[PDB]
Design a protein around this ligand. Structure first.
Ligand SMILES: *[C@@H]1O[C@H](CO)[C@@H](O[C@@H]2O[C@H](CO)[C@@H](O[C@@H]3O[C@H](CO)[C@@H](O)[C@H](O)[C@@H]3O)[C@H](O)[C@H]2NC(C)=O)[C@H](O)[C@H]1NC(C)=O
Ligand SMILES: *[C@@H]1O[C@H](CO)[C@@H](O[C@@H]2O[C@H](CO)[C@@H](O[C@@H]3O[C@H](CO)[C@@H](O)[C@H](O)[C@@H]3O)[C@H](O)[C@H]2NC(C)=O)[C@H](O)[C@H]1NC(C)=O
Ligand SMILES: CCCCCCCCCC(=O)O
Ligand SMILES: CCCCCCCCCC(=O)O
Lengths: 174, 174
């Protein structure tokens, strides 16, 4: 419409236990993706993309994403500074984005050598978008994972058409 | 019925003194609400919503409201152009609403750091609706305020069942 599905209350978003810095780092493929602003576009199905978590010196993350947007490889670099709890981050520099008023990152779950589920929320110019990414160390998607993902999203108020699974492409991202 | 309670004569609607531009701006929560077209719906109690007064360059107001209508966050943006007296505004663009013939806004009272009471009137397709909003800088509602609000409405010919107090929700509006 012109409307947006409410971001769930934080209490509904789990936080990994004993989140480990250096074990979560490295390349992560986005095999699952969902959010109030994410939608299924059959005309242009969403393509898989990778995101790299580089552990800096002061424990921050130099996060680089490699997407395949319209004929070319796009690169999004941004740093995630630690939050109040291991596994929580805020967007560094924030001022560099005069339109942003808040941006949180919450690692809901992970095993570090296979998959992960990360929650993102950010209010901008008075709009409250949020999303969940299903990370895979490989491009593989297990039916169990997929389902357990769809469940979390729904538990967050996300209808089916707001839950997408990027087509593995294998280019610009390998 | 099919009828509507008359809008009071303007003489019955006070206007704040020395209304201050930049001091009234910012986020306002709607803790009190009343009007000839507003009614108590126990089946669906009215939820609290916010309205933002953004002071533009040419002193106009970029007014944005964030409501929680049926599962989603709704956003209503409109500009309030100054009227004949500090604290009075008319709806900009008006033509963009071929059905509207008049729309006035009158800040009846405010302290800028706590509360405010604003009057709205607009004739549309020959119907004369009007309403009063009780603004709070926070979601708090003091018994004194509440009562002093109910009094103003009644003084305007508004029965009790036309005086509503939105349920604080704290979502889509924070
Ligand atoms: C965070 O990670 C990204 C990469 O994931 C780092 O960006 C990379 O920065 C290097 C050095 O600035 C870039 O390489 C240089 O590229 C230029 C041409 O653009 C070339 O002339 C140089 O010889 C060199 O190859 C690299 O292209 C760039 N990669 C991306 C994807 O932008 C970034 O520096 C990291 N941040 C920190 C603080 O380490
Ligand atoms: C009056 O205030 C409202 C906000 O209270 C302003 O609307 C906001 O406008 C910005 C920029 O046009 C929107 O942000 C952009 O959203 C798109 C997606 O819709 C995104 O692709 C852009 O990168 C950027 O984030 C913002 O969503 C929108 N907010 C709302 C609630 O509609 C409006 O522009 C203000 N009027 C003036 C004259 O400043
Ligand atoms: C203000 C810009 C931030 C982009 C918002 C979310 C991106 C999350 C990264 C990812 O999908 O792995
Ligand atoms: C023609 C549409 C105008 C809507 C009428 C009244 C809205 C007042 C704003 C508020 O409640 O804070």
């Amino acid at each position: 419409t012109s409307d947006l599905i409410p971001a769930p209350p934080l209490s509904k978003v789990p936080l990994q236990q004993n989140f480990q810095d250096n074990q979560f780092q490295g390349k992560w493929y986005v095999v699952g993706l969902a959010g109030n602003a994410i939608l299924r576009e059959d005309k242009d199905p969403q393509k898989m993309y990778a995101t790299i978590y580089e552990e800096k010196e002061d424990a921050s993350y130099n996060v680089t994403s490699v997407l395949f947007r319209k004929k070319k490889c796009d690169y999004a670099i941004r740093t995630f500074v630690p939050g109040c709890q291991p596994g929580e981050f805020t967007l560094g520099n924030i001022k560099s984005y005069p339109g942003l008023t808040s941006y949180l990152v919450r690692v809901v779950s992970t095993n570090y050598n296979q998959h992960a589920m990360v929650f993102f929320k950010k209010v901008s110019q008075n709009r409250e978008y949020f999303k969940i990414t299903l990370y895979g160390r490989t491009k593989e998607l297990t039916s169990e994972l997929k389902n357990n993902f769809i469940r979390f999203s729904k538990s967050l108020g996300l209808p089916e058409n707001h839950i997408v699974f990027p087509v593995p492409i294998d280019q610009c991202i390998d």
